[PDB]
């Protein structure tokens, strides 16, 4: 229903029901990996550095929410790559055009994780999983509501792994004479020894529901902690043996929600959140390690990369207000406002305060077509210390900055036939400048220059056909995307000209054109086949260089970015196998990624270029369920052909892996 309403909306949105994945060992990112146009790039292993890309936009251009709460101010101890899929009821992805109700600046798109808010009077859920490289993952979720309206819920989970899988790499030999060297002509098959990771999280919520003065009033508290061991650097040849990182996060929250506040059909929601994060990076070893686990003394030098015992503690807080109104089914109105304040400083504080307002109206005069128009107002305030001296390190003053912009968009859909739908969407999106870009130089004169926000024109077209023919069920969708982005904030080139320039500038333009195909066939309830294909071109769109010369890379593909990929799966179901209510599932999955170069494709001899190879991997899973999901056992084999996989250039990922999961659920 909710997944259906998201899928059939006029926006280019994809809704995935996570309840069908609760018996697997996946995280949120693994579930998101199946969305068309969405790519995951992980350094390798559990808890590794993960980058999510949507239509070519990555990092700061894609925004994440959990039940409408922005997550850009949450630490790494509670993130997409380390939360179990059991945490989510469903996942919504909005590509390019974002509906009013989120209040954020996102050129790329929005991902929203929706949890289960329709629990029973009492419920318990527990799962444990054991794996290949000493992997232990456990999850518990229990709660209950009483007849007086009081309700509570508790979530807890932990992930642990050694990440002790094998990689192929040249090793640094320590010679008997006291020297050392890495011979590239010799490649060894070595196991990972300093890659252990583990994170833990607890969430607790308590409140009141179904009251005359509040439909939902809840207070929540989340605590997360994380420990990581750094195994390599940017390239695999650099290896470490003692460097590590720690972190923790504390997150209180308040939510209020009511329907028909003062007049009929007027719904109101208010939400407030506070996040405190702590980080600790330690690099204090006195030895140099190689890939065999051996050690050699650094001869008085401390820090295998750079001596560091750094501790940081940051804080931020956000507030959200949403109001919905409607006159029948033909007229719908949405008003939203989000405030978000960040304090980077671990007398002048580096303060960022962002205010975003949105208004949307939908007209639906019939069941054949509907149209939505919306407008958004963006306002950012930045404040930082800047110096005015010969060396600029003695006298400091406050320097403030204000950036405002107006965005707008529309989205319409038309039902040509009973099962044929056509969507068309457009938005003008922004990405506002950050405090570090504005005041990085910490110079009074360079601070006054300022930066314009990055801007993008996003256009979407979709055509979908859905039909049921007896026992056959078919769904086909095709889509076209156009992105036009300008005013990218890039690093400036180091110069010694008579004119002084800041460390960042509004210089950069990218033109993206792409299409996607999705198919899903079902027969009765025992065979399901499906697949997605994505093909896009992302071109550098800057004619001249920063010094005024013709650019060599103008019109060429943007480097270090996969642009063609596909995924497919087939599932078989045997219901009432051994008794009524027991079911057996066998699922096959595969992923295809086309190779891409590390640097611009138009430069350098082809035989000397660093390239990521084309990759095609396969996955298998088997599940057995008893008493209508009361007891569940699962076995999975990942990369069952043992392929060499690389999301990043030289960072190898795990090979063949085996996992086993047991899960129980009770409720009433």
């Amino acid at each position: 229903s909710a997944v259906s309403r998201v899928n059939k909306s006029a926006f280019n949105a994809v809704a995935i029901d996570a309840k069908g994945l609760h018996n697997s060992t996946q995280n949120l990112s693994d579930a998101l990996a199946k969305v068309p146009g969405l790519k995951l790039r992980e350094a390798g292993g559990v808890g590794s550095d993960m980058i999510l890309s949507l239509d070519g936009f990555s990092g700061k251009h894609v925004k994440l929410f959990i039940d409408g709460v922005p997550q850009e101010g949450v630490g790494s101890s509670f993130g997409l790559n380390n939360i179990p899929i059991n945490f989510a009821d469903r996942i919504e992805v909005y590509r390019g055009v974002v509906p009013v109700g989120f209040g954020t600046d996102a050129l790329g798109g929005v991902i929203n994780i929706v949890t289960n808010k329709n629990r029973k009077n009492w419920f318990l859920d527990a799962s444990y999983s054991y794996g290949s490289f000493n992997t232990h993952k456990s999850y518990v979720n229990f709660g209950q509501t009483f007849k007086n309206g009081l309700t509570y819920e508790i979530n807890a989970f932990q992930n642990y792994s050694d990440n002790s899988y094998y990689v192929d790499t040249p090793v640094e030999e320590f010679y008997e004479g006291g020297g050392s060297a890495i011979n590239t002509d010799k490649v060894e098959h070595v196991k990972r020894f300093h890659d252990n990771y583990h994170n833990e999280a607890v969430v607790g919520k308590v409140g009141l529901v179904d009251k005359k003065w509040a439909d939902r009033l809840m207070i929540g508290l989340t605590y997360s902690r994380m420990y990581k061991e750094i195994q390599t650097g940017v390239v695999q040849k650099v290896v470490f043996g003692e460097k590590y990182r720690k972190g923790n996060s504390l997150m209180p929250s308040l939510e209020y929600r009511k329907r028909n506040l003062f007049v009929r059909n007027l719904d109101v929601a208010f939400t407030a959140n506070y996040n405190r994060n702590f980080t600790n990076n330690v690099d204090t070893a006195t030895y140099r390690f190689n890939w065999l686990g051996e050690k050699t003394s650094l001869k008085g030098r401390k820090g295998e990369q750079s001596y560091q015992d750094m501790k940081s503690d940051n804080d931020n807080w956000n507030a959200t207000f949403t109001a919905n109104y409607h006159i029948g089914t033909a007229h719908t109105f949405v008003l939203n406002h989000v405030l978000n304040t960040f304090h980077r400083e671990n007398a002048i504080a580096k303060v960022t305060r962002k205010n975003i307002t949105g208004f949307s109206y939908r007209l639906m005069p019939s069941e054949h077509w509907n149209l939505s128009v919306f407008g958004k107002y963006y306002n950012q305030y930045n404040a930082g210390p800047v110096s005015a001296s010969t060396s600029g390190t003695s006298n400091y003053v406050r320097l403030t900055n204000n950036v405002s912009s107006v965005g707008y968009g529309a989205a319409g859909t038309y039902f040509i036939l009973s099962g044929l739908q056509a969507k068309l969407s457009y938005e003008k999106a922004y990405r506002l400048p950050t405090n570090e870009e504005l005041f990085g130089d910490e110079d009074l004169e360079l601070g006054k220059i300022g930066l314009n926000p990055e801007k993008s024109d996003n256009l979407n077209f979709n055509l979908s056909y859905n039909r049921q023919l007896g026992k056959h069920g078919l769904y086909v969708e095709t889509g076209l995307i156009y992105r036009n982005t300008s005013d990218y904030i890039y690093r400036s080139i180091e110069t010694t000209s008579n004119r002084s320039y800041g460390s960042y500038s509004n210089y950069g333009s990218v033109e993206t054109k792409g299409y996607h195909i999705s198919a899903r066939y079902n027969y009765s309830c025992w065979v399901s086949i499906g697949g997605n294909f994505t093909q896009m071109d992302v071109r550098d769109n800057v004619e001249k260089t920063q010094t005024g010369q013709e650019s060599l890379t103008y019109g060429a593909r943007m480097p270090n970015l996969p642009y063609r990929f596909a995924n497919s799966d087939i599932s078989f179901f045997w219901r009432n196998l051994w008794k009524k209510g027991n079911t057996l599932t066998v699922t096959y999955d595969n992923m295809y990624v086309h190779g891409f170069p590390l640097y611009s494709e138009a430069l350098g001899a082809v035989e000397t270029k660093d390239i990521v190879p084309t990759q095609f991997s396969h996955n298998l899973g088997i599940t057995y369920s008893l008493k209508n999901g009361r007891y569940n056992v699962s076995f999975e084999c990942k990369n069952f052909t043992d392929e060499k996989l690389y999301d990043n250039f030289s960072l190898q990922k795990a090979g063949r892996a085996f996992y086993g999961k047991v899960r129980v659920y009770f409720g009433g």
């Binding site: 890495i182 390239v235 001869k299 008085g300 001596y307 110069t495 010694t496 010369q549 350098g604 001899a605």
Partner: protein, 425 residues
């Protein structure tokens, strides 16, 4: 915790990296302050280095109840500062003796028992640009060592830490262990200007990159070049600005290290191109006798990192290391040419040897080209390149993992990289 000097050797012939036991830098010059080595100058079968004072550290400022602290008001009371130049609590940042220069002489690349000599005519001898230290001690063709000083300590916030010595030149004669009577005031020959960098050209000719405005930490205004002849005006030094280069307003940057050959210099020049023009980065030949520049080979890239020669078994070629930056990503390309005086070269249309950017580039004779890079970055290894048997550029087999360095040089068969680090003794 104490401050020390870390020295690393790359032996060229046998492809081995070695680390030397960290030298104690605390009270290196006899006044409690730790130093950083600028320049590793091979001359007269000896090593000349400029130990530049770095002020007092946390250990130095608390030593024997503040024995070394001359200005207690300058000692940091709070832990803060920009990450590039962040400071800890209880340390004195810059040197408190800015009116002198020191030179250390070693007999081999084992760095034992330095011979320290002091002069009070010039401030410390090194160019400075943000976090970058530039060598300003050089050697003439007859063995004499010339020590140049730009007086950068003139832009210190504290007046006690400002120097009053104008930018100048002193000399150490070949086979001597002390400064002679030679002095030259460069701020009297250049109209009250200082310099950012200096190199040797040929004989006693030197090339100086001169400021057009005031000396500063970001290098703004260093858009002119001059030729200095040490024994010009009857052993008094003479300075002539170079002719033929583009105007200072039309210059974005120069190459880091020029290439000296046949009594002339080759410098990479990056211009600012007027709307409608087609000015591309090029290689300019500078003749020191007539102090004139001539445009030569055209380089179609956004930066130039190295110019040199490579030869192997009856093959020889000029190598230009060009840099291309786009999409907020940067790559380096080795381009082979037969001349540095005509023609054009580009990495476009899939040309050149593609590598990642390195922190330093250094040619070992016409035998090798070394890309120096520490643990951090896109590719945190030190690599080397040569010519294969049939005239093509190839990469040497061995690679190395080195610590961060602030100076580098060549002595004998070793490439030496040095920095100042934290250490325990």
């Amino acid at each position: 915790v104490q401050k020390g000097i870390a020295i690393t050797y790359l032996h060229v012939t046998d492809q081995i990296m070695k680390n030397r036991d960290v030298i104690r830098g605390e009270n290196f010059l006899g006044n409690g302050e730790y130093v950083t080595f600028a320049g590793i100058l091979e001359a007269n079968n000896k090593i000349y280095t400029a130990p530049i004072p770095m002020g007092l550290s946390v250990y130095g400022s608390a030593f024997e109840d503040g024995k070394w602290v001359k200005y207690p008001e300058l000692v940091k009371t709070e832990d803060g500062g920009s990450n590039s130049s962040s400071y800890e609590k209880g340390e004195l940042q810059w040197t408190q003796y800015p009116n002198e220069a020191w030179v250390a002489i070693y007999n081999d690349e084992n760095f034992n028992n330095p011979t320290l000599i002091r002069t009070d005519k010039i401030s410390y001898a090194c160019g400075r640009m943000r976090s970058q230290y530039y060598q300003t001690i050089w050697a003439a063709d007859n063995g004499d060592v010339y020590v140049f000083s730009p007086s950068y300590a003139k832009i210190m916030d504290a007046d006690v830490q400002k120097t009053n010595l104008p930018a100048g030149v002193v000399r150490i004669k070949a086979g001597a262990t002390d400064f002679d009577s030679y002095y030259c005031n460069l701020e009297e020959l250049s109209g009250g200007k200082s310099f950012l960098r200096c190199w040797h050209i040929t004989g006693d000719y030197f090339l100086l990159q001169m400021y057009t405005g005031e000396i500063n930490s970001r290098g703004t205004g260093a858009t002119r070049m001059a030729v200095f002849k040490a024994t010009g005006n009857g052993d008094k030094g003479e300075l002539y600005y170079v002719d033929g280069l583009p105007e200072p307003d039309r210059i974005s940057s120069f190459s880091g290290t020029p290439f000296c050959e046949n009594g002339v210099a080759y410098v990479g020049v990056i211009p600012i191109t007027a709307d409608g023009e087609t000015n591309h980065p090029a290689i300019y030949k500078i003749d020191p006798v007539t102090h004139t520049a001539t445009k030569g080979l055209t380089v179609n890239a956004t930066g130039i990192t190295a110019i040199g020669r490579l030869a192997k078994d009856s093959h020889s070629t000029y190598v230009v290391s060009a840099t291309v930056t786009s999409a907020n990503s940067t790559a380096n390309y080795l381009l082979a040419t037969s001349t540095l005086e005509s023609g054009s070269v580009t990495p476009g249309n899939n040309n050149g040897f593609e590598t990642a950017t390195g922190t330093a580039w250094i040619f070992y004779k016409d035998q090798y080209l070394y890309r120096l890079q520490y643990n951090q970055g896109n590719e945190g290894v030190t690599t080397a390149y040569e010519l294969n048997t049939n005239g093509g550029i190839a990469k040497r087999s061995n690679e190395y993992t080195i610590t961060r360095f602030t100076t580098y040089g060549i002595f004998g068969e070793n490439i030496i990289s040095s920095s100042a680090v934290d250490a325990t003794f």
